[PDB]
RNA sequence: UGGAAGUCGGAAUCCGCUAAGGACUGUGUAACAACUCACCUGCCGAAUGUACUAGCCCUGAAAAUGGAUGGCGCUCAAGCGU
């Protein structure tokens, strides 16, 4: 069955600018500006109402109709990122060897860099480079906590996932060796 | 001057009920020997039966009481022969108890019952007796409960 | 796992004997108003039936207790009926005759002491004298190569007959429990045995569709009784010794005579 | 599996005349054997097959049932 | 009796009721009844263990 | 649709009720209507409502129905044609949201006095306004979270540590004890569960319930009662204020 | 602000609606009438 | 699995064997004198194996 | 270490901070993983997987049928034969197999 | 102090019962929990029994 | 049962209050506690759920020189049905 018409709606807040041209969505807000290329998905964009963006698919199958929900959630995440932002709090815990975390900002590339030392007494220095637009700070309110903030949810969550996966324990019982850096909180900056 | 209430399970006529009680009443200043003596004195009516004992503790002395439970009342009303707990195990409470005794047990347990009337109280006691495994009036407690619903047996009101 | 005591006139349960962990497979009532039970929890228990209380508990067997037998079952089954074919006039005389028959059958060294033999699935029997020995068995009867199904004292109390699943019936001394002789000739497991009134003969009914009458003094197969088309489940010898009744899977009663 | 980077030996869809003839002969033998087994078959079969009836999503099933009642009543009146 | 002791013990107590997460075995099987018998049994067991040791050393 | 969520089958004793529960509620209400002089409508909005058992036990001579709102409305009768008694359709306009019916033979002033003197302290639900700021102190986390003094308190169970971490407390396990930061209460600030005037969400109310901190109360607000003799409904204080449908 | 908790922790996710691509073809009252007619037919 | 987790006890060496009723401080004494991690709790039969 | 030392470690220190959520996510991914295994395994491994899944489905259907039907010997034997393992127990003088395949002398 | 849940008579009886296992050995009775109750605070007939 | 409070086991599995709640579905404790599921109520809003059947697709077992719908290649076909 091909469905003749299907549509979705995305509300836009008052202080948010949205510009779509050739399925290239640019969303600007108080916190910055984001872009996303959605040219791989067949969708007709329109302005159905003042402050509401309409998404239409004509003569589409169930798969094509279902893709519009993903497009809606992606654009809503961009809007939330430029309005409130995204923040991931991570905790690093240890048993014997204290994990040393150093955060620097590379001046030439403009990206943050996280260096991890003394992970279960290892002599190697782990280096993980954040996605651009993601800021990392060592928290002062809580013990052994990093805070990753940004406008792109995908970039923030992927940077958190890279830091989590760089400190992997190998050839040890994970019921006994509990050392690592884990995502402890997800939310908005505002 | 603070009053503490401690509920435990004890066997009547035994001093060893304080064995699991002494580690927590020791710091409270209570003497386990006299606490067990008071427990045995309170539970001398309930020889061989697992009963619930309430301890009220204030100024480092304990007052003992026996909280009545439906299972203990039914097993006491069964009037089984005296037995040795250590040598005779895996017993079954298969004797018969009268409906008047069931109604008296329900009247005793009215202070715990949330039911509206003695019919519901007697039905709760009959269900407890059915779980125990005894008979009522030579018949099944479930059958007498069904008869009380169907109206053949009249339960007095209050 | 219970034994209930019923009053026959009213149909009311007076006592319930509980404490067994398995099915109570056999019950006897002795002349001292003691109830003996054997159960599948490898236990043989003695109860006072007036109070309904447990007096003795024996846990010597290693598997299911199949059968129990008393030294005075032959006179306890018949009470005051005996060879005279006449009954006493009054109930007191009848009770006195029954009591004196029980005492004559149950006297051990001048005092009344009922002896109990228990046949189990651990290939063994045990002999108990609760009056004189208590919880210590008189003897352990060994020699069967398979489970023992039925066991019975002789009417004179000198012999014990046991039927086993090893195709054999064995004879034992009823005093010290020593093995005497083996009655060989059955080809399927022997299910039941029964004594004659004069303690000369034992009839055994087996799974091999046959009854066999054995002379115990010569230790020989006196008579062979075929005719059942299927397995034999129940065998009885009459108290006056006139008839032997058998029944089983062939759905027909068979009475045998001399 | 690493099929894309290191494919294995291909499975040929090109037939051989010997295999084609053998498959045709076995198909003919199988249909003859099925005819023989259906002839010799002792399985019970009904004289009248179980008819499935009228579908529920057909919008005029009620009018069809009305017509069936009316026709049966008319046939009973005529007979 | 020896040809059936193992099957008899397994029939009396299955493996799952003896050891494991669902075991119900609480009382062990002992070759001694009293403390004096246990002391004599331990002395005889130590003597037999030692004697087996010198016999194996000599062999 | 081959791609679908596999429904779990429940191997549990209790089944779904269905239409027979609705018919039983209909029959119970329609058979308790003629036996009682007054029918109160009460509301308990955004409350835990487990103290209605105590209310039922106290008012043993009365009958309390706490079923579905539309089911009770159809049991009473929404229109004057289908109403069971004279004027119950005038009582049905109060049945919006979480409501209950109270069939009684007592005096209306007695019922109002009982429900005005009924006082109970209850755990807050989501959406309520926090009356005060709750802060778990740094160091060993105790059972009450600092409401009682720590000398009178007991350490919290070590099985609650993953639940506290999931609810957002940055707690850790030190030698078998749940601690907020360090065992000596260093290098970590206290955890503010809620602030005064802040609308509580379900995470904060779950944290307060696990720390046994009650920030609300259980109030039963009477909207109006119907009398069988008069045949008319009397409007009360909460009845004049609450929306009707 | 949202009061409920989301199971996977993505609190920014919107309150989704059910995926019903055939929504709006038939009305509720017509479906009630069809329910009555189908029940009588059965 | 139980044999793998069993402690190693040499029967022919210098040994201090602590015994008595439950809840009398045996595990507390062993924790005080040795490095063994045996639990100390106020309920009876906290220690259910040889340490 | 001695006795239940891993259980003691879990009591004293807990587990990894992501263990519960990762176990939940893996249990949630089991459906996609089972479909991928059904559509992508090859050969004898695929045949054994399909057979063992067929066995699981049969056992699950039996369990569901028993849970639906929760709310609803043969030959006479004596007492001493009860609770034992007993067999079920179900002119032209023709044998059960009157004709078999003939064997030639070279075979 | 009998805070273990068992009487001093029971402890002495257990010691006397397991005394035959102590043959050819080295026995020390350690009175624990001296911060709670001293040996001098006992009944002198208890003290005579311990002695 | 040393301990076993729905949740190591064996067997029973009833009643009240009910809107509904198992003499308990799992996590958990030494035992409790605590959490959770079944079931019920409030919010929301219109179509769903299960089991089978028929099409096409994937798997449903393969060795060994490099190769075959005849080859190129073909994806609203240059495949399949009419
Ligand atoms: Mg201890």
SS3 per-residue string spanning I73-106: CCCCCCCCCCCCCCCCCCCCCCCCCCCCCCCCCC
d(CA C174, CA C214): 18
Q: Is the CB of I3 under 7 A from strand K?
A: no
Beta bridge partners of C225: C211
A44: three-class secondary structure by DSSP: strand
Chain H, residues 25-44, CB within 8 A of chain J, namely 25, 28-29, 44
Residues 6+ apart with CB under 8 A from H18: H26, H29, H30
J21 lies within 8 A of chain E by CB? yes
Q: E11 vs C63: CB contact, 8 Å cut-off? A: yes
d(CA B19, CA B36): 9
CA closest to K28 C1', residue? F159
Pairing status of strand C232-237 against strand C244-248: antiparallel
Are C182 and C172 in contact, with CB atoms under 8 Å apart? no
Closest nucleotide relative to residue F49's CA, C1' based: K41
Q: Which residues numbered 55-114 in chain B sit less than 7 A from strand K, measured from CB?
A: 89, 113-114
| C125-128 β-sheet, strand order | C65-70, C116-120, C125-128, C139-141
Q: Is the CB of G16 under 7 A from strand K?
A: no
Q: CA of I12: which chain H residue's CA is closest?
A: H39
Sign, Cα dihedral of E1, E7, E11, E15: positive
State in Å: Cα H39 to ligand 1 middle: 8
Spatial distance from the CA of F65 to the C1' of K21 (Å):
17
Instruction: Show residues of chain H in contact with B23, CB under 8 Å.
Output: 23, 42-44
G37 lies within 8 A of chain D by CB? yes
> What ranges make up the beta strands (E) of chain B?
4-11, 50-58, 61-67, 96-97, 135-136
Elucidation method: cryo-EM
> In chain J, count of helices (H) and strands (E)?
2, 0
Beta bridge partners of C26: C38
B22 lies within 8 A of chain J by CB? yes
Pairing status of strand B96-97 against strand B135-136: parallel
Instruction: Give start and end residues of each alpha helix (H) in chain F.
Output: 19-32, 52-58, 69-76, 88-91, 108-117, 161-167, 202-210, 237-241
CA closest to K62 C1', residue? I43
F45 phi/psi in degrees, rounded to 5: -100, 130
Q: Is the CB of G24 under 7 A from strand K?
A: yes
> In chain E, count of helices (H) and strands (E)?
2, 0
| A86-93 β-sheet, strand order | A134-138, A145-150, A86-93, A180-187
DSSP string, C13-28: EEEEEE--SS-EEEEE
d(CA J25, CA J32): 21
Tell me how far CA of residue B62 lies from CA of B10, B26, B56, B58, C128, in angstroms: 16, 12, 5, 7, 52
Are B21 and H40 in contact, with CB atoms under 8 Å apart? no
Instruction: Show residues of chain A in contact with G20, CB under 8 Å.
Output: none
F208 phi/psi in degrees, rounded to 5: -65, -40
| Structural Rg of chain G based on CA atoms | 18
d(CA B23, CA B28): 9
Chain K: positions less than 7 Å from a protein CB are 1-4, 8-9, 12-25, 28-30, 32-35, 37-43, 46-50, 58-64, 66-71
Spatial distance from the CA of F206 to the C1' of K82 (Å):
65
Chains A and E touch (3+ CB pairs under 8 A): no
Q: CA of C41: which chain E residue's CA is closest?
A: E12
d(CA A109, CA J48): 87
Scored b (16 or more CB within 10 A) or e, C29-38 reads ebbbebbbbb
Spatial distance from the CA of I90 to the C1' of K72 (Å):
69
| Closest to C153 measured CA to CA, from C73, C243, C211, C75 | C73
Q: I18 vs A182: CB contact, 8 Å cut-off? A: yes
Are B126 and B144 in contact, with CB atoms under 8 Å apart? yes
Are B125 and B142 in contact, with CB atoms under 8 Å apart? no
Q: CA of E39: which chain J residue's CA is closest?
A: J21
Tell me how far CA of residue F225 lies from CA of B100, F37, F70, F81, I37, in angstroms: 42, 10, 18, 20, 65
Q: Which residues numbered 14-43 in chain F sit less than 7 A from strand K, measured from CB?
A: 14-18, 21, 24-25, 28
- Mutation to test the I interface, candidates C233, C236, C250, most I Cβ within 10 Å: C233
Q: At what angle do helices B118-132 and B70-77 cross, to 10 degrees?
A: 70
d(CA C29, CA C31): 7
- Give the DSSP letter of residue B43: G
Are C247 and C253 in contact, with CB atoms under 8 Å apart? yes
B86 lies within 8 A of chain C by CB? no
| Exposed / middle / buried, residue F200 (Cβ in 10 Å: 0-12, 13-18, 19+) | buried
Closest nucleotide relative to residue B92's CA, C1' based: K11
Instruction: Show residues of chain F in contact with G1, CB under 8 Å.
Output: 199, 201
Residues 6+ apart with CB under 8 A from A141: F188, F189
D18: three-class secondary structure by DSSP: helix
| Exposed / middle / buried, residue J50 (Cβ in 10 Å: 0-12, 13-18, 19+) | middle
Residues 6+ apart with CB under 8 A from D64: D54, D58
State in Å: Cα H29 to ligand 1 middle: 12
Q: Which two tokens stand for residue C141?
A: 């009867």
Q: Is the CB of I14 under 7 A from strand K?
A: no
Residue ranges for the known binding site of J for GTP are 32-35
- Give the DSSP letter of residue B87: T
Closest nucleotide relative to residue F46's CA, C1' based: K42
Q: CA of G34: which chain D residue's CA is closest?
A: D59
DSSP string, F184-237: TS-S---EEEE-TTPBP-HHHHHHHHHTT---EE---EEEEEEETTT--EEE-H
Q: Which two tokens stand for residue C151?
A: 């066991």
| Closest to B83 measured CA to CA, from C16, C20, C54 | C54
Sign, Cα dihedral of B118, B120, B121, B126: positive
Sign, Cα dihedral of I66, I70, I75, I81: positive
Q: Which two tokens stand for residue E1?
A: 């009796």
State in Å: Cα H17 to ligand 1 middle: 17
F217 phi/psi in degrees, rounded to 5: -140, 155
Residues 6+ apart with CB under 8 A from D47: none
Q: Is the CB of F240 under 7 A from strand K?
A: no
> What ranges make up the beta strands (E) of C20-147?
24-29, 34-39, 44-48, 53-58, 65-70, 107-108, 111-112, 116-120, 125-128, 139-141
Q: Hunting for tokens 């403009």 — which residue is that?
A: A110
Are C35 and C17 in contact, with CB atoms under 8 Å apart? yes
| Closest to F182 measured CA to CA, from F144, F140, F154, F142 | F140
- Give the DSSP letter of residue F15: P
Q: What share of chain I is helix, strand, coil (3-state, %, to 5)?
A: 55, 0, 45
Among the partner-chain residues A91, A143, A185, the one whose CB lies closest to the CB of F187 is A143
Q: F9 vs I64: CB contact, 8 Å cut-off? A: yes
Residues 6+ apart with CB under 8 A from F106: F38, F61, F62
B52 phi/psi in degrees, rounded to 5: -95, 125
> What ranges make up the beta strands (E) of F81-188?
99-104, 121-122, 134-136, 139-140, 171-174, 177-180
State in Å: Cα H24 to ligand 1 middle: 7
User: How wide is the angle at C-alpha I97 spanned by C-alphas I92 and I100, nearest 5°?
Assistant: 130
Resolution (A): 2.5
Q: How far is F60 from chain B, CA to nearest CA, in Å?
A: 6
Beta bridge partners of A11: A52
Closest nucleotide relative to residue F24's CA, C1' based: K19
Are H23 and H44 in contact, with CB atoms under 8 Å apart? yes
d(CA B59, CA C124): 65
């Amino acid at each position: 069955m091909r469905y003749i018409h299907s549509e979705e709606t995305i509300p836009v807040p008052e202080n948010v600018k949205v510009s779509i041209k050739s399925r290239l969505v640019t969303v600007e807000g108080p916190r910055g500006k984001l872009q996303k290329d959605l040219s791989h998905i067949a969708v007709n964009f329109s302005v159905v109402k003042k402050g509401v963006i309409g998404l239409e698919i004509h003569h589409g199958s169930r798969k094509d109709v279902a893709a519009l929900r993903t497009v809606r959630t992606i654009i809503n995440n961009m809007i939330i990122g430029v309005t409130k932002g995204f923040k991931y709090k991570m905790r690093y815990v240890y048993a014997h060897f204290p994990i040393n975390v150093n955060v620097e900002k590379n001046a030439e590339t403009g990206c943050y860099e996280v260096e991890i030392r003394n992970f279960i007494g290892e002599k190697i220095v782990r280096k993980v480079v954040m996605a651009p637009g993601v800021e990392v700070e060592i928290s002062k309110a809580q013990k052994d906590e990093l805070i990753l903030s940004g406008n792109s949810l995908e970039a923030v969550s992927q940077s958190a996932a890279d830091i989590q996966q760089i400190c992997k324990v190998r050839n040890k019982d994970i019921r006994k060796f509990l050392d690592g850096i884990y995502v402890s909180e997800k939310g908005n900056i505002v | 001057n603070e009053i503490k209430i401690i509920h435990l399970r004890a066997t009547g006529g035994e001093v060893g009920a304080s064995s699991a009680l002494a580690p927590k009443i020791g710091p409270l200043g209570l003497s386990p020997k006299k606490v067990g003596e008071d427990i045995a004195k309170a539970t001398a009516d309930w020889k061989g039966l697992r009963v619930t004992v309430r301890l009220t503790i204030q100024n480092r002395q304990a007052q003992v009481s026996v909280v009545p439970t439906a299972s203990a009342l039914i097993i006491r009303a069964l009037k089984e022969p005296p037995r040795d707990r250590k040598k005779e195990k895996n017993i079954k409470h298969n004797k018969s108890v009268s409906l008047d005794e069931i109604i008296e047990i329900a009247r005793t347990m009215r202070f715990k019952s949330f039911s509206k009337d003695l019919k519901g109280g007697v039905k709760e006691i009959l269900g407890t007796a059915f779980s125990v495994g005894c008979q009522v009036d030579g018949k099944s407690p479930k059958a007498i409960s069904d008869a009380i619903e169907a109206g053949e047996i009249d339960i007095p009101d209050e | 796992c219970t034994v209930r005591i019923w009053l026959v006139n009213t149909g009311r349960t007076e006592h319930v004997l509980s404490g067994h962990k398995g099915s109570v497979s056999c019950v006897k009532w002795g002349g001292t108003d003691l109830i003996y039970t054997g159960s599948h929890d490898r236990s043989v228990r003695v109860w006072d039936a007036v109070k309904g209380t447990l007096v003795h508990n024996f846990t010597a067997h290693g598997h299911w207790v199949n059968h129990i037998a008393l030294s005075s079952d032959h006179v306890l089954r018949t009470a005051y009926h005996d060879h005279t074919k006449e009954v006493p006039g009054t109930e007191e005389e009848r009770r006195a005759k029954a009591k004196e028959r029980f005492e004559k059958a149950a006297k051990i060294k001048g005092k009344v002491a009922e002896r109990l033999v228990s046949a189990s699935d651990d290939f063994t029997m045990y002999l108990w004298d609760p009056t004189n020995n208590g919880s210590k068995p008189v003897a352990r009867l060994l020699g069967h190569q398979n489970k023992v199904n039925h066991v019975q004292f002789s009417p004179d109390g000198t012999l014990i007959a046991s039927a086993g699943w090893d195709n054999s019936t064995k004879l034992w001394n009823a005093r010290d429990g020593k093995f005497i002789k083996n009655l060989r000739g059955h080809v399927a497991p022997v299910y039941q045995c029964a004594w004659s009134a004069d303690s000369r003969l034992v009839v055994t009914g087996s799974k091999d569709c046959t009854l066999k009458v054995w002379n115990v003094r010569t230790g020989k197969l006196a008579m062979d009784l075929p005719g059942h088309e299927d397995e034999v489940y129940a065998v009885d010898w009459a108290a006056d010794g006139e008839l032997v009744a058998s029944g089983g899977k062939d759905k027909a009663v068979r009475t045998w005579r001399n | 599996a690493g099929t894309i980077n290191k494919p294995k030996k291909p499975t040929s869809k090109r037939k051989t005349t010997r295999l084609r003839a053998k498959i045709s002969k076995r198909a003919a033998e199988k249909k003859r054997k099925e005819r023989k087994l259906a002839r010799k078959n002792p399985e019970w079969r009904s004289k009248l097959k179980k008819d499935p009836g009228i579908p529920n999503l057909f919008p005029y099933k009620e009018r069809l049932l009305q017509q069936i009642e009316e026709e049966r009543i008319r046939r009973k009146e005529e007979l | 009796l020896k040809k059936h002791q193992a099957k008899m013990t397994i029939e009396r107590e299955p493996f799952s009721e003896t050891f494991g997460p669902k075991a119900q075995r609480k009382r062990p099987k002992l070759s001694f009844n009293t403390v004096d018998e246990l002391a004599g049994y331990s002395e005889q067991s130590l003597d037999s263990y030692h004697a087996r040791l010198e016999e194996k050393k000599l062999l | 649709p081959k791609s679908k969520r596999a429904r779990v089958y429940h191997l549990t004793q209790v089944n779904k009720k269905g239409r027979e529960a609705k018919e039983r509620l209909f029959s119970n209400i329609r058979e308790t209507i003629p036996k009682y002089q007054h029918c109160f409508v009460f509301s308990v909005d955004n409350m835990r409502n487990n103290y209605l058992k105590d209310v039922r036990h106290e008012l043993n001579d009365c009958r309390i129905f706490f079923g579905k709102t539309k089911l009770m409305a159809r049991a009473l009768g929404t229109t004057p044609e289908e109403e069971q008694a004279d004027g119950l359709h005038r009582l049905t306009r109060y049945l919006t949201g979480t409501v209950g019916l109270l069939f009684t033979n007592r005096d209306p002033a007695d019922i109002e006095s009982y429900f005005s003197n009924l006082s109970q302290v209850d755990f807050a639900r989501a959406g309520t306004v926090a009356p005060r700021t709750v802060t778990v102190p740094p160091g060993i986390v105790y059972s009450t979270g600092g409401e009682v003094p720590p000398e009178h308190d007991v350490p919290v169970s070590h099985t609650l540590e993953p639940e506290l971490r999931r609810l957002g407390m940055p707690v850790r396990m030190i030698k078998g004890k749940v601690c907020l930061g360090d065992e000596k209460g260093e290098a970590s600030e206290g955890y503010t569960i809620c602030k005064e005037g802040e609308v509580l969400d379900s995470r904060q109310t779950r944290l307060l319930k696990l720390f046994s901190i009650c920030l609300s109360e259980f109030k039963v607000s009477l909207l109006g009662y119907w009398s069988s003799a008069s045949g008319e409904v009397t409007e009360l204080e909460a009845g004049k204020t609450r929306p009707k449908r | 602000k949202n009061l409920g908790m989301r199971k996977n922790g993505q609190v920014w996710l919107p309150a989704k609606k059910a995926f019903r691509p055939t929504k709006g073809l038939t009305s509720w009252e017509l479906r009630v009438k069809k329910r009555q007619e189908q029940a009588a037919m059965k | 699995q139980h044999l793998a987790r069993l402690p190693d006890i040499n029967p022919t060496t210098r040994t201090l064997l602590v015994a008595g009723f439950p809840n009398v401080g045996k595990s507390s004494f062993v924790r005080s004198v040795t490095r063994a991690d045996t639990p100390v709790e106020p309920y009876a039969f906290t220690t259910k194996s040889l340490f | 270490p001695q006795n239940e030392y891993i259980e003691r470690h879990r009591k004293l220190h807990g587990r990894r901070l992501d263990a519960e959520e990762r176990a939940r996510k893996k249990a949630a991914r089991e459906g996609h993983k089972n479909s991928e295994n059904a559509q992508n395994l090859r050969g004898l491994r695929a045949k054994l997987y399909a057979k063992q899944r067929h066995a699981q489905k049969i056992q699950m259907r039996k369990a569901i049928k028993q849970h639906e039907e929760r709310n609803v010997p043969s030959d006479p034997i004596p007492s001493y034969l009860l609770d034992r393992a007993n067999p079920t127990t179900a002119a032209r003088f023709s044998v059960p197999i009157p004709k078999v395949r003939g064997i030639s002398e070279e075979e | 102090s009998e805070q273990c849940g068992f009487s001093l008579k029971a402890q002495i009886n257990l010691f006397k019962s397991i005394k035959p296992l102590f043959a050819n050995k080295m026995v020390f009775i350690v009175l624990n929990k001296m911060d709670i109750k001293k040996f001098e605070e006992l009944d002198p007939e208890m003290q005579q029994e311990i002695n």
